[PDB]
């Protein structure tokens, strides 16, 4: 389903989860004095214990601003994968595309290239979204 301002945090079902060829598009703006956000695909929505994330998307203002990517499976996070780029900035809009492959997802934020991120979990076991931290949302679309 097509979101419209959700509350953040938000974590939702994705109907139908994902498959390759379609994109996240996500819309939002970040506030003034935003430290960090991030989007965050998972297994489910448990909280204890936490809900395995395949996919975590984590921007971070510090500094000259980076993107972590990690996966967290059994409650423990493996490795960092850290692009030293900084694409969002306070005060603005973005948009997000998150197309999803078979191998990896690529991200690109306002229409430029971010990153890749080779699949850490199995595509299939993605059924949720999260939203949190400093972030609003406008929309959330899943593109077929
Ligand atoms: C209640 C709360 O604050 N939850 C946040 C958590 C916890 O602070 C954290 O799990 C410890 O209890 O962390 C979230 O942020 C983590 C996440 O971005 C991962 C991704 O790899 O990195 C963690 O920081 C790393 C850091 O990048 C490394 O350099 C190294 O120093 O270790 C730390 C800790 O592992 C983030 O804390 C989370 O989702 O787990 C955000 C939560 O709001």
Redesign the pocket.
Known sequence: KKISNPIIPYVGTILGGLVPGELIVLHGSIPDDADRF?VDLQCGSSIKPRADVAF?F?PRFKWSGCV?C?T?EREK?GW?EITYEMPFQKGRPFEIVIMILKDKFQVSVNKKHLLLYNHRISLERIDTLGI??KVQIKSIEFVS
């Open positions: 991030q975590h984590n972590v990690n967290l996070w960092e949190y931290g």
